[PDB]
Amino acid sequence: TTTKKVKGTVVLMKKNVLDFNDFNASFLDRLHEFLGNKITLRLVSSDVTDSENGSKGKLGKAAHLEDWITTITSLTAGESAFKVTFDYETDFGYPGAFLIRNSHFSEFLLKSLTLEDVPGHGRVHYICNSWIYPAKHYTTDRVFFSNKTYLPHETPATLLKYREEELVSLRGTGEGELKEWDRVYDYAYYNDLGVPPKNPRPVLGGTQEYPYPRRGRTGRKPTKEDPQTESRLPITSSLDIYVPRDERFGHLKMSDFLAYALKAIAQFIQPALEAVFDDTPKEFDSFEDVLKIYEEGIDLPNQALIDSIVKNIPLEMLKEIFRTDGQKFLKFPVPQVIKEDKTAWRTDEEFAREMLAGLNPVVIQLLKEFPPKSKLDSESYGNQNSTITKSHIEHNLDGLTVEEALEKERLFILDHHDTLMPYLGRVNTTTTKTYASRTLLFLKDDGTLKPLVIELSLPHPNGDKFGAVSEVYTPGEGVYDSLWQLAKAFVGVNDSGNHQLISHWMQTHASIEPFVIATNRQLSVLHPVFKLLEPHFRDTMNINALARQILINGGGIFEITVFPSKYAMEMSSFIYKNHWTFPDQALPAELKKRGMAVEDPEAPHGLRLRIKDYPYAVDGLEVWYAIESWVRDYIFLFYKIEEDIQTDTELQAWWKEVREEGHGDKKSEPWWPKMQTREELVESCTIIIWVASALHAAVNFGQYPVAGYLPNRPTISRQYMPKENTPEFEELEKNPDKVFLKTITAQLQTLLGISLIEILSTHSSDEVYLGQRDSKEWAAEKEALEAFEKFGEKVKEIEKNIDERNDDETLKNRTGLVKMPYTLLFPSSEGGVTGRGIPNSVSI
Predict the structure, then answer these.
(1) Disulfide-capable partner of 17 in 78, 122, 150, 384 (CB 3.0 to 4.6 Å)?
(2) Distance between CA atoms of 740 and 724, rounded to whole angstroms?
(3) Catalytic residue among 700, 712, 813, 840
(4) One of 392, 504, 527, 536 is an active-site residue; which one?
(5) Which CATH architecture group holds 4-157?
(6) Which fold has domain 177-373+429-435+482-844?
(7) Domain limits, CATH 2.60.60.20, in the chain
(8) Residue 700 assigned ligand-binding role
(9) Phi, psi (rounded to 5 degrees) for 174
(10) Is 844 considered catalytic here?
C-alpha cells in the first residue's frame, strides 16, 4: 500500500461570528489556534472494512488542519477555511464518511468538507452543518457522511452502523434535562406555558379535552406545586430555552436577530408601556390621533425612562422596531394598507375584499342553506341557527331571490359563530367584550363581493345551554350607518383572533414542529426524504421555543394583544381537536372544503374557482402545483417501484411516529394516510412544504401591511354595541368615531401589537426563499440538482404571472381601492418588512 496524499478543505464559522455582537473582519484572527494537534479528522471507508473497529468500515490515519486560506467568501459571511492533507491509501475505496474530534476550548460550526483528487472518485463533498463542541461534551466522535443520498437498503454496509448510531443518539433516552450541546430530538406536551403561582394554564396534549401537537422536549425540572407543569426560565434570564444545537444559529448581524427583538419587546418596551400608560391613560380621541403614531411618534413622559429602553436594545434593531426620526420617540412606518388612501378601509368594498386578498384569506366559505344553520350540538349548546331572515338581505341581491342566489352560487359566508360561542361566556368576563359573527356577502356580476348583513350573537343570558341572543346589523343610512361600522369592527376582532391563533399559530407554527422532530429522529441525514424537507424546517424550532418563552405563556404577549386573553391558547386546542386534519391542509382540499372550488374536468387543474378572482387561491394554486410537481420529480428519482416505499425501514418509522406520538392526540383518526404507495408520499410531503412555505407566508408577512393600521383590523373590542335610547347611543350620533376607538383596542395594547407584528412581518437578510438552498451541492446525484433547478425556474415563472395579474385591471379584487397589489405570494423578496416573499421555512 503506497500511501498517496489528497488535498482537503474544511470550512467553519467561528463562534464569535454568529454571536450577537456585530461581525467585523476583526473576528477572523487568532486563526492559528484551530491549527495544530487540536482538531482531528479521520476518514472512514464505504468499500473496505476495518476488522478491528467493528464491521463498521476502515478508518484512515488522522489529519489536522494546517494553515488557513482566505477567500472572497471568507470576508463575506465570515466562513474561514483551513488547509488539510490526507495520507490516502490506494486500497481505501470511497470515503463515505469522516470523523472529527475538537480539542480546542470553544465550539465552532462546521459547514463543510471538500476532498480534491480523491483517487478513483475525483471530488467528494461533505455537507455538515453542525456545531462541534469540545470533545469533553461527547461520549464519541462526531461523524458526517458524504453528500451521496441513500435509502436504507442502498447504504454501504460499512456505514450502516455509523448511520444507525447517530439515529439512536438523536432520539436520546427520553429522560433527563437536555443540555446545551445535546442534539436530542424528542416530544413533550405544551406544559411549560404557565406559572402556577401567577397565571396558571392547563396542559395541552395527552388528554381528550386538550389535544394539541407536540413540542421539543426540554426536560426541565417540574414545579413544586404541580408535577404536570415544567419550570419556566425567568424573564430576566439571559439564557434561552433548549433546542437541538443544530436548530439554532447566530446571524452575522444583530439586526437579523428577529428572535431577540421580540425578547426585547417583552422585556423592555412592555414594562415601560405599562409604566407610562399606567400613571396616565390616554385614549385615541380620534382617527388622526391614530395617524399621529406614523407622523410624529408618541412622546414618553420623560427621557429618563428611555435612558433604559434605547440603552438595552441595539440600535439597528431599534430601527427595525421603531423610527428614530421626527420629534416623537414612538414612531412606526406608514403601513401599506394606509399608504395610498387613508380612508379606503371604512369602505365595505375593502372589507369584503380582504376576505379574499387579505391578511387572513382562508376563512370565507360558500353558503348552501339559508338562513344559515350551526353545526353545534343541539342538546348542549341550544338553538344556534341564524336569526337572519330572508328579508334582511333580500332587496340587496340585484333582483335574484335568495333561493335563486343560493342556487346560483352567489351567496358567501364568513362564519365565526361556531368556534367562538363555547368560549364566549368565559372570554367575555376578561378585559375583552365581544360577539360571535356571521357575515353574509353577495357576489356581484363583476367578481366582487358585497357585504349584506352582519349578525352578532351573544351567549344566551340564562346560560350556554339555552341558546344565543343575537342582534343583526345591516347597511343603513344615518347613525344606523354608524352601527354598521361597529359591526365591521367586531368581525375584525373575531377574524384577527382566528388569524393569529388558528391560521398562523395552530396551522403553521405549532403543527409543523412535530415533523421536524420526527424527521431527524427517524430519517438519517443520508435519506432522500430528509434532504427534501430539511430546508423547510430551518429555524422553525428555535422561534417556537421563543414563543413559548415570551409569547404564548401565561401572561404572554399574545394574551395581552388578542381578544381571547387567558383562554387564548386553550381555544386553539378546541379548534385543533374539532377541525384539524392532515389531508385537508392541501390547498385544493381546503378550498373544496370551504366550497370555494370544485372538481371540473375542463378546468386548468381539475379545479374550478367559484370566485374566479380570489388572489390567495389563484397565486397559491400555481405555487401548490409547482411544489407538487417538484416533490413528484424527486420522489421518483429514489423510489422507482412502490415496494421501495413499503420496505423503507425509516420512512415507515418516520410516519408511524408522526401519528402515534407527534400528533398522537389524533392518533386514532381514520384520515391518516397509510404510506404504502408512492403517491401518498408525493402528496403528504407536498403538504408539509406548502404549510411551511407559502401557507405560513400568506398569513405572516401581511400582518404589518394590512393590520399595522389598528382601525382596519382591530385586535380586541372593549365594549358591546350601544343599546338604543341610551346615553351612548346619543353619543354615537354626536361622535360615532370615538365610540369606535372606545370599543376597540386601547393604546397600550396597540403599541404592543403594531410593534409585535412589525418584527413578525420583517424579512431577514439571512432569509432563504422558495426555490433556493443554503449551498448548491446538497446532493451528489445530478438528476436531483436539475429537478431542483427546474423547480426554481418554475418558481421564477410564477413570479411573472403574479406581476401580470396585478397590472391586469380586469381583476378587481387584486389591487382593491387601497391600491395595494396582492404580493403575499410573490416568492422572492429582499430584507425587511417588504410585504412579499415566501421563505422556505417557518422562520418567524
Answers:
(1) 78
(2) 16
(3) 700
(4) 504
(5) Sandwich (2.60)
(6) Lipoxygenase-1; domain 5 (1.20.245)
(7) 4-157
(8) yes
(9) 80, 10
(10) yes
